[PDB]
Write an enzyme that holds these catalytic residues in place. Sequence first.
Site, PDB file in Angstrom:
ATOM      1  N   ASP A 288       0.861  -1.189   0.000  1.00 34.77           N
ATOM      2  CA  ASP A 288       0.000   0.000   0.000  1.00 34.77           C
ATOM      3  C   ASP A 288       0.893   1.234   0.000  1.00 34.77           C
ATOM      4  O   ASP A 288       0.512   2.285  -0.501  1.00 34.77           O
ATOM      5  CB  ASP A 288      -0.853   0.065   1.269  1.00 34.77           C
ATOM      6  CG  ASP A 288      -1.931  -0.980   1.303  1.00 34.77           C
ATOM      7  OD1 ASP A 288      -2.370  -1.411   0.226  1.00 34.77           O
ATOM      8  OD2 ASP A 288      -2.350  -1.365   2.411  1.00 34.77           O
ATOM      9  N   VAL A 296      -5.135  -0.272  -5.374  1.00 35.33           N
ATOM     10  CA  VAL A 296      -6.148  -0.819  -4.454  1.00 35.33           C
ATOM     11  C   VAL A 296      -5.687  -0.833  -3.005  1.00 35.33           C
ATOM     12  O   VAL A 296      -4.575  -1.305  -2.713  1.00 35.33           O
ATOM     13  CB  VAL A 296      -6.624  -2.247  -4.864  1.00 35.33           C
ATOM     14  CG1 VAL A 296      -7.652  -2.756  -3.855  1.00 35.33           C
ATOM     15  CG2 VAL A 296      -7.250  -2.216  -6.253  1.00 35.33           C
ATOM     16  N   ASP A 303      -4.119   7.795   1.884  1.00 34.75           N
ATOM     17  CA  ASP A 303      -3.742   7.898   0.483  1.00 34.75           C
ATOM     18  C   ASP A 303      -2.219   8.010   0.423  1.00 34.75           C
ATOM     19  O   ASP A 303      -1.649   9.029   0.825  1.00 34.75           O
ATOM     20  CB  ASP A 303      -4.410   9.137  -0.142  1.00 34.75           C
ATOM     21  CG  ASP A 303      -4.143   9.288  -1.649  1.00 34.75           C
ATOM     22  OD1 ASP A 303      -3.539   8.405  -2.293  1.00 34.75           O
ATOM     23  OD2 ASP A 303      -4.565  10.318  -2.206  1.00 34.75           O
TER      24      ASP A 303
HETATM   25 CA   LIG Z   1      -3.086  -2.721  -1.661  1.00 35.54          CA
END
Ligand SMILES: [Ca+2]
Length: 320
Positions: A288, A296, A303
């Site tokens: 992430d 995703v 963010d």
């Molecule tokens: Ca992800």
Amino acid sequence: ADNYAATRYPIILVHGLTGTDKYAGVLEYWYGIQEDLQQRGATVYVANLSGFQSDDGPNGRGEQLLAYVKTVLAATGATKVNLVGHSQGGLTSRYVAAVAPDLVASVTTIGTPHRGSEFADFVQGVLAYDPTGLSSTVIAAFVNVFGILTSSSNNTNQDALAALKTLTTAQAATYNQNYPSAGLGAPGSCQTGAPTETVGGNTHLLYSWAGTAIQPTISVFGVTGATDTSTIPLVDPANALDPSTLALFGTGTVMVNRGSGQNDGVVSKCSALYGQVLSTSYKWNHLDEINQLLGVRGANAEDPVAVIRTHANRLKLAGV
Ligand SMILES: [Ca+2]
């Protein structure tokens, strides 16, 4: 467009493991981050290093990045660069900052295993269990072919076992001995160091941030369960649309059982601390942090693109 992210010195994004591809190959590593930065006035370059290799060494990623930095300086006409690395890329960045302090203005590490990865220890222990030792050769041959095939430049310089050895807890301690930094605290302290380092005349701004989506919950009968705080319990679409979401929850469970504490599935909180720690509260798993896969993320995740953009502005206001 505007100059929100218009730093004085060029920004070089430095990748971690997987494929000797800066990005591309079959999908960009820093998903949508280069475009966003450029749109806000930043000069950005993406390093294309070996996906599997150690950082130090004649043929390691460190020397490859040094070469790259020099190429960028010559092209831009700039005198220094701002290095920002994710995962092992943060270790590659520290190498250049150590070996060429006059060509670096700042080092920012995102989810970097400065003290190694407990999951790395796990994988190697498994590999070493084979009494015939044959498995290590076959898996290495398999991972090396993968690296060169996934490499954009189809770089043949891959060494799966070297890369595995590098992310190891013990090996990291040796790395920190050979390439010290004022940004690092005492080993075993789970503490950071100073926010800047002055390597004779040259001053470096040091930053870091970690993702701690994987939290330890309870322990029973010896095992400790974990929880993925980046997703809403069970129903989160990230669990379906991004396969790394569950995968990292699993590797994160192994880590919790190896005593790592809260982590992002690969790197623990304590191992990621370096320089000025901007935050270790991000509800992100290891991927992430770089806006993967294909942007995703769980419903509770911040963010990443916004955080990185805000950081380029932070550098700008700092004078680099
Ligand atoms: Ca992800």
